[PDB]
Design a protein around this ligand. Structure first.
Ligand SMILES: [Ca+2]
Ligand SMILES: [Ca+2]
Ligand SMILES: [Ca+2]
Ligand SMILES: [Ca+2]
Ligand SMILES: [Ca+2]
Ligand SMILES: [Ca+2]
Ligand SMILES: [Ca+2]
Ligand SMILES: [Ca+2]
Ligand SMILES: [Zn+2]
Ligand SMILES: [Zn+2]
Ligand SMILES: [Zn+2]
Ligand SMILES: [Zn+2]
Lengths: 136, 170, 136, 170, 136, 136, 170, 170
């Protein structure tokens, strides 16, 4: 909502609300600010912005699926998974591209992607070559 | 850039300036903040619609300094005007945007270019311009000046109500 | 463990309380016993469900051998071993398959497997190719 | 998919539903259980025993929705019925499992398939059906109905003692 | 900084208080200013001497740009970026040479360098061979 | 001092103290038990037994050289160095063999070994091959 | 192995048993705890000296169970005797070690083998045996029995003083 | 090498000695400073200036021990003298630096080497020695001794003001 006021400025004077756009007022007041979500994977405390996990709603960390892994007592999400592959999964929400680490095993990597509900078709061109070749 | 420095010259708080900076840097990290950058950002908001043309007019609205490409300083001060600035600054920014050739006037095709730019980036067949000029022009000559625009928005209480809604960032 | 009530359902009526084998009745009251065990390896605090370590009882972390590494004063198991290879050892309890990290040395890796009591004959086909070849 | 939503439509608490989902997902990571998945689960419980046939009957008991493969929502409600639900729900579910062709009645050969299905997954040579029907059928026509099954299980207090044992998870 | 009193010693007698250039007098009282700065990257708490970040002032961690990432409530800089590549970026301030991790992807690595404002033309000859070749 | 009482048992009856052996009584009572030393490298808290760092006294972590890096306030040793290479350096005190990580840069690795006062001649045969080849 | 179990059958505390286990596992982690293992350990204590022969006699002292190779259970109970056990157990262990062929007696060459084994692993030319037998043998026949050894160490107050020094582990 | 030991033989505190060692070791990681190392340090302080010659004179000022290359112990005591030590130690050290051939006296050409050594590492064209000798030499024979240097620096209160400025580290 830092770039939208610019689109909004271009509509002032000739378009109330109208058809089906999405720039005018931040309705519902979704400004529940931004909180650092603590994602505890295998002991390692990964820290990310709540908005970052919102980027891809059609995944485990995206949808309300992660709530099945939220410990209310420690007020954090716990995953009994690999901490190393999770760093790639978390960086996917950040950069926008899914990266394959050259050192990790393909099957180990594929299993973790299937857990967090991320399809391997999303793997960027930057290491799509490396992924395909190591998957035989 | 300068966190304490910007706090004085803008209306945003220290906390809001960081969020805005984080939101800016994520769309262009040290990288060339140009017209293409804008095209990429607004294409994400509105799928199946081409943001090329609007990106140009929006880039044209900026560039006051020297480097051509718009820095964060110019990005946030323009946003300080659009979100917190007085009614005569918000409209002044909007008028400056609608005036493409930077002459000081808005004409039929000039306004047509903006309407086309938004409709393309996202009921009347782009002839909202004819509705726009009919009740924004005092002279009825086909030219709307800055003073003409300012006073014509005051009479429409519906614009003032929306333009002074107060958006909160963060 | 909570897939059993389905197996238990298909037996009600023709073999109830008569003999049974391993299904019928959650005996010994082993419930609520699952807590997060903390595994301090070289300062790096690993965290796993205690049932995950119970998966393979015929190992150090599986058997009561880990209790020699437990510290009552900090309520955690401390291991003066490499934190990096332990991630693989811990992941074995989770995924079911032992993965060889491509970046690590085979000698260091074999030494750590020998410590935790996991045999290298368990390394999955997923990276059995990598392990055999790098072991000359 | 909804933790607060499922808490209403099941008997499990918020804490139990989390444990059950973790227990569920560890067998099918966003894969959604099919017949093969079931076979792999009960093969783990029962070594040196083919669980193919039983997994087939167990899978046929599900699927009220669309995709064929049973989702967690339907997995947990079935488990809610089996662990916490009333006696005319636990037996109703068990009866539904015994009725393979899904047509209101359990016959001699139908029951024989299931007895063989459990014996195979792991003193009377499979013909324990003869003891079952002799003390479950009121009509004695080789057909056990739902009402016939429900009232016949009440008479044996030993089943009611085991069926209402209350089994907590976690 | 404490190697200067030696340079200062060779000037006493023939150019004292007369003109000097950058040596003579620890001006501005910049002493005791060195504290451990905490750099929270994705949950992973990195810790460095503040003078180490001051080494290259023409970068994000070098200039006052990092203050946009500072949280007064937790008294630390938080970065919603990859913790792994940051280790390399931080090591650049320490060693003086930027190292490319062989296991990481060139695209992910270039994206992170662009964020912190370090140019890839600084990558040492030590792994310039690796960087150029893996960037096709 | 778990294996020495066995050597000690073989001398009972025919050798008071005598010449220059080292089995009989733990003189000086060096049994200052064993404390977990917290080694803070770049933010990562490495935890090792004091005895482990004693293994090789002719190094930085071995000799009283580490005391120049001990912060008395946080009651821990701080090193503004790479946390990743330190794991190899710490594992050297543990396993007895110095391992080279296949992913790290040779110059980066050599620089860290020179800092902790460990010579590359100690690198085990398990990855002496990998070290020599990557050093051109 | 068994932490609570060993605490009862040994004199070490729970805390000492962990340290001893950590000290043991570091010298042989699940690996074959054999004669060679001993050779490697004692070569570290005493450089420029060959521990081969002593390792053998020390390995011969163990092995009570079945597997030949000595487990931790047998390692720590022998150490419980050597560090905490009564004087008649410490000497009993030492006597058992000096008796190679496991016959119950110590002879000139038998004792010579031990002296040679330690001198080799690390002022009289190995003829301390002649000094040993001169004041350890009551019969003066060249044979020292268990009872002969026990009482002959009591008279030398210098041994009792050293043998009851109390070593603390950890 | 000893933190408690050096705390006695220097003026620095335990906290300062740690900072100084960190500052020292970061330039020579267990390498122990030689002439080349010095050149690399002052080249970093003074860009576009050859520091080879000065590093040579600065290195010759050290080495009282054995290896030629100056260790931290000798590095820090020299720095202790220069920063905290008495006036007849700071000047004594400075005098020792000016006496290149290490023979009790500073001559016109000897001083000329050092003035050139600093000028090269970074208004009078190097001949600032002429001003130096005219107001430092009591005899006026072209030789400045130690006693001649010490008393001549006392007379100029402006040097004493700068030399006793007290410079804290950390
Ligand atoms: Ca115009
Ligand atoms: Ca007009
Ligand atoms: Ca039927
Ligand atoms: Ca019937
Ligand atoms: Ca005998
Ligand atoms: Ca006798
Ligand atoms: Ca001279
Ligand atoms: Ca003179
Ligand atoms: Zn990539
Ligand atoms: Zn694998
Ligand atoms: Zn490198
Ligand atoms: Zn190796």
């Amino acid at each position: 909502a830092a770039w939208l006021p610019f689109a909004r400025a271009a509509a002032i004077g000739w378009m109330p609300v109208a058809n089906c756009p999405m720039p005018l007022a931040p309705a519902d007041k979704n400004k529940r600010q931004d909180e650092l979500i603590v994602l505890n994977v295998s002991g390692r405390r990964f820290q990310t912005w709540r908005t970052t996990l919102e980027r891809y709603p059609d995944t485990l960390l995206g949808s309300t699926e992660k709530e099945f892994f939220f410990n209310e007592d420690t007020k954090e999400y716990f995953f009994d998974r690999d901490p190393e592959v999770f760093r790639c999964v978390l960086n996917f929400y950040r950069t926008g591209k899914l990266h394959y680490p050259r050192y990790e095993c393909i099957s180990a990597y594929d299993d973790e992607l299937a857990f967090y509900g991320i399809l391997p078709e999303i793997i960027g061109d930057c290491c799509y070559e490396e992924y395909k070749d190591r998957k035989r | 850039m300068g966190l304490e420095q910007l706090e004085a010259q803008t209306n945003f708080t220290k906390r809001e300036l960081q969020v805005l900076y984080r939101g800016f840097k994520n769309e262009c990290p040290s990288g060339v903040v140009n017209e293409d950058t804008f095209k990429q950002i607004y294409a994400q908001f509105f799928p199946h619609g081409d943001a090329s043309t609007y990106a140009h007019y929006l880039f044209n609205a900026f560039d006051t300094t020297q480097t051509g490409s718009v820095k964060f300083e110019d990005f946030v001060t323009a946003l300080s005007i659009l979100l917190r600035g007085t009614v005569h600054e918000k409209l002044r920014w909007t008028f400056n945007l609608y005036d493409i050739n930077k002459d000081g006037y808005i004409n039929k095709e000039e306004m047509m270019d903006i309407v086309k730019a938004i409709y393309d980036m996202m009921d009347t067949p782009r002839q909202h311009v004819d509705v726009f000029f009919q009740k924004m022009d005092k002279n009825k000559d086909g030219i709307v000046t800055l003073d003409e625009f300012l006073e014509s928005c005051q009479e429409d209480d519906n614009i003032m109500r929306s333009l002074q809604l107060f958006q909160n960032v963060m």
